[PDB]
Design a protein around this ligand. Structure first.
Ligand SMILES: [Fe+2]
Length: 362
């Protein structure tokens, strides 16, 4: 049990979409659709009227991935987009997340309050066809915290079939040179609270903790070379590290994804040895049955547990050429609570963040 001061400065409903700034929105969006089991939902390319950028939205349950690339400089759906910036971002950082957007009740207001509390402004509020309002502030590095509030986006034409299980964004993570400033800077204008080996982190969270922003900090010292000090060097600075994808069946998902590694999909971190799993049976027993412990071992899932739930997670190697951004698929078993005010659901951060992993290799 921990402390939650529910001190947001604005209403933060839930994670919306993640926007990648590529060099070619087309291939990445294709590669991904195959790899994570996501559907081609919408677009805003030349075929729609856009002559500034190509943008493809792939979805899976509430999870939405947006891929945008710039056209030749010689009418654009996303108003905050501008050539040179998209160019440079990609030229200097490579494939990666440019935007971490979250739903809010009033984007202009959210952006209003945020700016009055130290938030650095990149993009001003913009109402698009009296329907959606979009505003963007600086999170860390060249990643922006995009505010999206409603009455996908205007200008995108709907498209009309994969599904490996992915359902929503659990948490987004960003590595920075110094955890200190970053934390106070983010928590400062948002009003998030602290949810909770060559790295240091803390996790800010929205009121309902259905928005988790874990931030990492490198650790100079005699114990290998900080992986995070490695991300900062190849990514050329602070940038979004990994995205946790919430699946309702991590077994359904890893079967599907792993069957696709050698044919376009994603590769996975080397899995724990058989002694790791043998321990598992007598450590998470009551949560996962034998046939399930055996499935973890076969897909290479890492398990960790705490006072409210159990967590099954795994990790992907870099999504791109640089050992920078990678993906994670997870499942949080436990914490399910059915109240009389609403429907049955599950608290946020259930099981935590597998913190009890690297240790479990006793
Ligand atoms: Fe994570």
């Amino acid at each position: 049990v921990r402390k939650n001061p529910k001190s947001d400065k604005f209403k933060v409903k839930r994670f919306h979409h993640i926007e990648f700034w590529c060099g070619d929105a087309t291939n990445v969006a294709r590669r991904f659709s195959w790899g994570l089991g996501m559907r081609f939902s919408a677009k805003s390319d030349l075929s729609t009227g856009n002559m500034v950028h190509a943008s493809y939205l792939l979805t899976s349950g509430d999870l939405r991935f947006l891929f945008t690339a710039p056209y030749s400089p010689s009418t654009a759906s996303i108003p905050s987009f501008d050539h040179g910036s998209c160019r440079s971002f990609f030229s200097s950082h490579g494939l990666g997340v440019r935007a971490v957007a979250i739903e809010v009740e009033d984007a202009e207001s959210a952006f209003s309050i945020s700016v009055a509390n130290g938030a650095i402004p990149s993009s001003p509020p913009i109402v698009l066809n009296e329907a959606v309002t979009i505003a963007e502030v600086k999170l860390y590095g060249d990643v922006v915290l995009r505010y999206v509030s409603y009455k996908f986006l205007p200008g995108f034409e709907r498209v009309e079939p994969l599904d490996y299980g992915i359902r929503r964004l659990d948490h987004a993570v960003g590595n920075v040179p110094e955890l200190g400033p970053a934390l106070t800077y983010v928590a400062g204008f948002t009003g998030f609270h602290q949810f909770a080996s060559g790295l240091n982190s803390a996790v800010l969270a929205s009121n309902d903790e259905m928005v988790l922003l874990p931030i990492n900090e490198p650790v100079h010292g005699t114990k290998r070379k900080s992986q995070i000090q490695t991300y900062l060097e190849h990514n050329e600075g602070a940038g979004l590290q990994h995205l946790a994808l919430m699946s309702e069946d991590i077994f359904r998902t890893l079967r599907e994804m792993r069957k696709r590694s050698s044919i376009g999909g994603f590769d996975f971190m080397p899995s724990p040895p058989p002694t790791y799993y043998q321990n598992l049976k007598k450590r998470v027993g009551d949560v996962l049955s034998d046939d399930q412990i055996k499935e973890c071992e076969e897909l290479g899932i890492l398990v960790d547990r705490d006072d409210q739930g159990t967590l099954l997670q795994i990790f992907t190697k870099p999504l791109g050429d640089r050992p920078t951004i990678f993906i994670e698929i997870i499942q949080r078993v436990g914490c399910m609570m059915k109240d009389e005010e609403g429907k049955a659901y599950q608290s946020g951060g259930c099981g935590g963040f597998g913190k009890g992993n690297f240790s479990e290799l006793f």
